[PDB]
A paper describes a structure:
A bacterial multicomponent acyltransferase from Pseudomonas protegens (PpATase) catalyzes such Friedel–Crafts C‐acylation of phenolic substrates in aqueous solution, reaching up to >99 % conversion without the need for CoA‐activated reagents. We determined X‐ray crystal structures of the native and ligand‐bound complexes. This multimeric enzyme consists of three subunits: PhlA, PhlB, and PhlC, arranged in a Phl(A2C2)2B4 composition. The composition of the multimeric enzyme complex is thus best described as Phl(A2C2)2B4, in which the four copies of PhlB mediate the binding of two PhlA and two PhlC dimers to form the complete oligomer.
Orthorhombic crystals of PpATase were soaked with the native acetyl donor/acceptor MAPG, and the structure of the complex was solved at 3.4 Å resolution. The orthogonal crystals, on the other hand, contain two copies of the full dodecamer in the asymmetric unit. Residual density was observed in the vicinity of residue Cys88 in four out of the eight crystallographically independent copies of the PhlC subunit. This density was compatible with an acetylated Cys88 residue and with a (deacetylated) PG molecule bound at this site. The resulting structure revealed that only residues from PhlC interact with the bound PG. Specifically, the side chains of His56 and of Tyr124 and His347 form hydrogen bonds with the hydroxy groups at positions 1 and 3, respectively, of the aromatic ring. In contrast, the hydroxy group at position 5 is apparently not involved in any direct interactions with PhlC. Instead, it points towards a small cavity lined by mostly hydrophobic residues (such as Phe148, Leu209, and Leu300). The carbonyl oxygen atom of the Cys88‐bound acetyl group is positioned in the “oxyanion hole” of the α/β‐hydrolase‐type fold forming hydrogen bonds with the main‐chain amide groups of Cys88 itself and of Gly385. The acetyl group is oriented more or less parallel to the aromatic ring, and its carbonyl carbon atom is appropriately positioned for an electrophilic attack on the C‐6 atom of the substrate, with distances between the two atoms ranging from 3 to 3.5 Å.
Residue numbers in the entry:
A (entry chain N), B (entry chain E): 2 to 146
C (entry chain O): 3 to 398
D (entry chain F): 4 to 398
E (entry chain A): 5 to 362
F (entry chain D): 4 to 362
G (entry chain J): 182 to 362
Amino acid sequence: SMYPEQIHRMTTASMLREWREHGGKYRLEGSQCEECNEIFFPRRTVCGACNSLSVKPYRCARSGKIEVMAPAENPILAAMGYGETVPRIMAMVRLDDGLVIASEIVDVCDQQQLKVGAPVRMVIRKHVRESNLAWQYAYKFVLDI
Amino acid sequence: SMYPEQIHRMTTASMLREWREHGGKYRLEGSQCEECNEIFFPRRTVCGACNSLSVKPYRCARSGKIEVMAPAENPILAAMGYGETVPRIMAMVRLDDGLVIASEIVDVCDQQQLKVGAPVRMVIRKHVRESNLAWQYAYKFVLDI
Amino acid sequence: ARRVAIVSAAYTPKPGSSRVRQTFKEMIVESAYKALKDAKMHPREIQAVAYGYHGEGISEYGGLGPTISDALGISPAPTFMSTANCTSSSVSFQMGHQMVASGEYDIVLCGGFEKMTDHFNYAEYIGSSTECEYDYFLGISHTDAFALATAEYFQKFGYAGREADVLATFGRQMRIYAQNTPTATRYGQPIPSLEVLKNSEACGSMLAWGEASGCAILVAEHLAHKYTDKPVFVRGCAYTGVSHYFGTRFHNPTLHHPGLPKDVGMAVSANSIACAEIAYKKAGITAKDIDVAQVYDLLGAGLIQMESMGICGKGQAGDFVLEGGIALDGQLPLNTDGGNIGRGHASGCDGILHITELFRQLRGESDNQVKGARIGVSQNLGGYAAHNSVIVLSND
Amino acid sequence: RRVAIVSAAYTPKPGSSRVRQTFKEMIVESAYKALKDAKMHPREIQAVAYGYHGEGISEYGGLGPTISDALGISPAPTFMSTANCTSSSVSFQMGHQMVASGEYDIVLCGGFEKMTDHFNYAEYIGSSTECEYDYFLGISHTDAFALATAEYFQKFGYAGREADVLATFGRQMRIYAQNTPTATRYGQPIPSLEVLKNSEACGSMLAWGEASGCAILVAEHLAHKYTDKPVFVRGCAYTGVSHYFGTRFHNPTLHHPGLPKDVGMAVSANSIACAEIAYKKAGITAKDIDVAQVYDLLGAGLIQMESMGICGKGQAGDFVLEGGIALDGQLPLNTDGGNIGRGHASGCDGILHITELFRQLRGESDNQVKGARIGVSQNLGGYAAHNSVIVLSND
Amino acid sequence: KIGIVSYGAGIPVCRLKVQEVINVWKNTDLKLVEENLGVTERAVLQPDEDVITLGVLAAQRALDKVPGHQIEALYLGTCTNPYDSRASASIILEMLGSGYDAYCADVQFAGKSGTSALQICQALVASGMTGSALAIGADTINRNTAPGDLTESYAGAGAAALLIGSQDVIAEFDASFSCAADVADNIRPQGDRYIRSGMGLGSDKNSIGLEDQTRRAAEGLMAKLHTSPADYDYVVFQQNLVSTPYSLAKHLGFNPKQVEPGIYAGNVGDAGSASPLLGLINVLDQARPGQKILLVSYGFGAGSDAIALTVTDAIEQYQKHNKPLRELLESKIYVDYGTSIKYEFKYLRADYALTAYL
Amino acid sequence: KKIGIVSYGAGIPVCRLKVQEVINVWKNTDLKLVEENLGVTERAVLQPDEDVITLGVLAAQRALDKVPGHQIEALYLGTCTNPYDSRASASIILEMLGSGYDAYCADVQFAGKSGTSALQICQALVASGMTGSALAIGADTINRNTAPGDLTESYAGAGAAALLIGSQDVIAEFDASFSCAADVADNIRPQGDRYIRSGMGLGSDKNSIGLEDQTRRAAEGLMAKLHTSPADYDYVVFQQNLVSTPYSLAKHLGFNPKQVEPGIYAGNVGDAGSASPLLGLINVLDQARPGQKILLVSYGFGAGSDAIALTVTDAIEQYQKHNKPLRELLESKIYVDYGTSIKYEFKYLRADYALTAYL
Amino acid sequence: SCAADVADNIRPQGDRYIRSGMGLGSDKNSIGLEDQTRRAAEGLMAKLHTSPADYDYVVFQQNLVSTPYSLAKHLGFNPKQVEPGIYAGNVGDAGSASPLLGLINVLDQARPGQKILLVSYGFGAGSDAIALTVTDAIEQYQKHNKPLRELLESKIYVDYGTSIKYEFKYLRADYALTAYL
Ligand SMILES: Oc1cc(O)cc(O)c1
Ligand SMILES: [Zn+2]
Ligand SMILES: [Zn+2]
């Protein structure tokens, strides 16, 4: 503020972390194996099933349904950058291609419409600010209705 | 700033850490063993030589001589909060009771007087600001002539 | 390939109570020197130590090995560190067992600790031990996984209308065990009614956060006679690891195991089945041999572990708990010291807390004692089953 | 039972950064290259012992299961080791005990450091000491080595030869690294001695980088399937002493007989104790050593050679000045170039030592000690807070 | 024949009734804002929304009409830019994942940034420098409007994206005319968060800025095309309020039938750079082939952009399967004033937060 | 008819601050590194009464003075240190020029490539026939938006450049262009912040992910479009925050040092921001002969890059017959100490609310 | 002691810098510095029934070397009663310590029995007057004591750039990524 005395901070994030993960967070990019066509998310260097080094980027399905959901209403567990919205609706989203993404549901226009198995689609939203002052953007899911 | 959005920080120091260490940092309090009369710094619960739990605090001698010194002039190795004073003179201080403290020398009025074996005294100075916005004070040493 | 026995085990009492007056160095010395006194052994007799904590991000203290050794005054005895969530002590115990069994060290100390009050808000830090880029940095806490895991279990196993009763019954049974255990945090408190517990937070299944350090002394079998009258041996132990990411529970091509159920989900922990099957084969027992057990309890996560441990069939853990089966006269007593709900929970110290109660059980010293117990098993998970540790102990 | 190293590999040029790949990609690179050398399938690994500085760099904690999934070996367990520069040295000793205990037959041991994920990795380094009385006060590891170097030269009457000793030690690392392909300073011209005396840190400053390394440990009876010439582990020792730099001078907590009365930073009491325990466990004395590896930074190499028993107290400077650590010398040191020439990633440093000794015992090193039957790795964490001495022999 | 190929829009779902703002501040008449100005509620920006969030949504919705499109140019028009140095259009380009080799920049001129960027894209395609181009006009006026400001009750946010191309055009680009001057009616200096007025709100402020530049641009384009107000089926103005296009029409010689199709901001408020583009979307959503459209936008510190369009016969096949803007505006969540101030970060909170609630 | 640059003008502050003055105060970097390797011996200082619009209109007016009686059809100001975050600063410069009111006007912003981005837009307006001519301005005050104690403070400067695009009396023809972009937050300044901040520590690692990559991609992309190699171009112009940068990129891209040297100017100016690629082109255009081929590639952080290829026409000889070269303009300089420089650029932490000038 | 509401210098809550209520000059001194100081001194002397001539030493607020002399001339004290207390030629305005630091310098050379009159001024506005007598124990005290003046000889010189840097007067980034970034 008015006294520009540096304050101690152990960890300052370099831009490289999010720079390498632009594909995964902005475009929901996973990985697919060339030998067996098994798909994973998040991206991985080594295939799991056949254990081949040959793995290539894969665009996960941006549509899906809610496998399981649980509201986050406890203020003790509110994280910095996410305490403004109460409650956050956490949910596991079974995409159209079978993969499951751990994210949250936003813009709930109708409370009655939201239930288990309801169709949702991926959207890009703002997340907690980086330690290097850069805005962090990543995926969230809204009801596709 | 003008946009009060929470910024991510993995670690936020509790005030407890510095609270328990006021004796060590403000008053240079180490530990003395009752049974075998051996002294250490920093403070410890178990005596090293005799392995007795009967240990009590001990006020180390706040005077001593410079055992070995090395200037820190490298800007790549400058730490946050300590980058304003260049160069910082790091020193190992052999207290008058025989213990050795790792600190730095400040207020160098005469450069010729700063050499190995010079007598110094402990002083209280400001250190890096705490993660909890509280100012941090701890010991340093100046030439005692 | 020699045998290893536990001569002593102890931990700071009331682990669900915070110890804001002592540093973590003071806390660690307390549990170790109390355990050494129980084993009639000098602290210099320890040749190495295997200790564990969540990570350098809590107390801002890294490379803790040598600081632990100096804190205990065993220098130059080495200290081996393990940073593995709630299984930090379970992995430190397994590390110590491998150190004695290898013959490189004769007497080892294995422990864990968590001094959470050194962090302003320790609950936010916890998420730093996952797939942080895709969960921690997105606002996904560890408590979220257990909340979703509890939801999927009740929803796919036909427990609709009974969700509040099952959670309250498990939570109430933990209070009953912890009321008479002096080291438990909820010790001496009155037992809330079942209807009161259903209206409480998390339907009475919320754990008690706190701080504690624990440890156990492992020694070579031939040396065990000097230090203890009744030693507890290690039949077998297994440790397994899968992706921290919560989504991979439903889709885990990396994990390779046979006989795993096709419908793997958060309700059916695939990694927990694998770890149990490896440990049981290695320990030479089936699930039907367990006389008393210890699992990680938080919301409905205890139910998921009982089914993965083989105590009851898939989807039957809820009905098992409702039938008073984990009671002292029940078919299998579960968390006889009170568990994380009653005894308390410090993530770093959780593994030792499990061994200690199992250790006391096999020596007939537990406050709620299983009559004629011969086999004790500790089920522990780190993150949401990213880590999983199953340890088997027998008294003879 | 006996354990043998069938293969060891690490990402090339560890002193140079790899900003394009994540730390997962970096760990897989060294791991799967090491598996190809040992003719073994990745699913054959039963457990892993890996090491990194701490969760503060990449903000990734509880890394074990992430490593197992990254390698694609789940449900195989990964045991984590967070012990400064000796993270790989400690993790290798962890794998040795897993195989020797018989609980695991095949174990992968390594370390890594992805320093570029932290904005300023250097100011984070101090997070692994007595943080309340040095990290929070502005005292870094680099301060300790500078003081230790100053006490050594001043206590042992090296006045006037300090720049020469450090430059002679530094230039020997440059010469070794020039013909080592994986070294960072590979292929560079050799600067003159006088140029190095006027350069930064008198030419003894190491090369900061990032790398992942690993070595495969297997039980003795299984070793013949994977390699023709395995390297065995004679003995290893690990010792713990107070992180605080002042305790080197006065440490009644350290109980070890026969220590010199003038213990300080110039005479490492912990490094002597660790060396003696390892030498006894391996059944060899200092005269048996054919080639060694030290943690080289400023004059810390000089202190380590004396604590290792290679030369008397105060002789290392004169030993290095007389060209003793050269290839033709009495005892070659850091034949791959060391931290000055090969580079160094703090978590990965222990494997970087073992790999060169592993290569040297098989006659495969680019600066080859002829007929080397034993190799010794000296590694320290903090300023001798950790100390790790591992002895490897080919017979 | 170069013009708009497809379009997409992005609107925040949270709504704040105008009465809520009046009851707290009591700084203006409710009858005036609801009836005269024509705004009964405004859009509330959530904590996880900004220019890029709404902008990439509108851009993604426009590109979804053209599957597999390769982006050759992307210009973000905004005056409430999340970055004062470095272009946010680069981030939106990254999120679309349609290619890296593209003309990219941030265009800024208050409410005409959206149209000014539309003129950029048009020039690129017409000059053959690219084959297609993407224009985005987005603004978070609600984020950059101070609490207690007279215009707080009708400050909103929105994003509109239009793809310019030569293949399958739904609305041709006939000609355009633009003007500018130094009229400090509204200014936000560097570092200021809130947009500020240069003089008191009223008809005097509108005559020198809003009405002056709009008339000059509209006349300039019509004189170039030898057209009068009667030749255009629709007219689209800057729409900070519902009253602004109607008031500008009466001043310019347009009839109310020509304005009403473009009116959308009854429940959104001032959408900033998107208001002339969102109004064009509401017009294109029900237009028949052949109809002529005149769009004139106004940006303060003033200048104006005039653009004339012709709806092609391909508009029929476009509307068969598409969601109209009026339907998008149906989805809304209501919040009180206390919540709206929390979501938009307008509480004076501590510079350094130890925890989220401490 | 050929469309290209008709005239140009530049505006540069007269105040200079020797680099050594900054190092002595902060001691945050090696003096030999900046003076010899980086190549900046002194940097430009912003007076209290000048900014982007001051330098811009000065550069804009100087180019319009070569074309008497000109009427402005379009004016685009490219800058990342914009005096206004809302409303266009270009509209102010339009009013100051007094050469017309009816013009396409906006502010273009993309870090260091805002100048060329505005140049590309003006080209598209003229080539598409939407206007008959167009005026592009690249300006920046990096020194104003660089914090004291920043590593890059010693070579942070300011400058403005303006180019007139037209179809009559063209001195430099516009052949083709190529642009790319990506989300590489190597340097960023969020809204509300005054100072440009770095995304990672300075070094060759930070260069490889942003400066080197985007310049290489844009350059090779353009040269493949025209089917030319580095040897076809007589001059090459890169981003010139430092004198070392155009040389380093050439070595990386395969241009010999002789193709770079004509564009060097910033030895006594420092980082000129969005004007550095255009100022380099101006120093090239001052000495070029007819027929010479110029390849210009710019860099803006948060990264994107713009590649533009030019040919010098026969009209260049008539143009420079009566023209002040940029090198001559760079001789006029006033020197200040560090104390005055901090006072001039408003970097002292002074009272929020000032009762008088000195109270 | 005396006080009043004279806002000649003020620092509102949250302000870092001390601000003046009016332009510097002799007029500003008369309403605050001169008024309150005269009021407190005259009030004290009337209580003690003493005149300026009875005191060996006088100690005023010492924001400047000139302030005690001008106040003394105003209140009727000859220069020799002031000069022993002066120290701030190379220190500047020492704030709340200026009346106390002036007394210390007086006590360093004082003899037993000597009378000291100390009158301090704090803006906003108020004045504290205290009268002292030196005891016989001062002789023993001064036998082993480092005088203030000897301590004031130790100094390290800096330029304006460093001084502004040392005192955090540069407008730096609110959030600093590293020490120099
Ligand atoms: O690592 C942890 C996870 C969790 O769910 C709870 C806890 O206390 C620690
Ligand atoms: Zn595969
Ligand atoms: Zn003792």
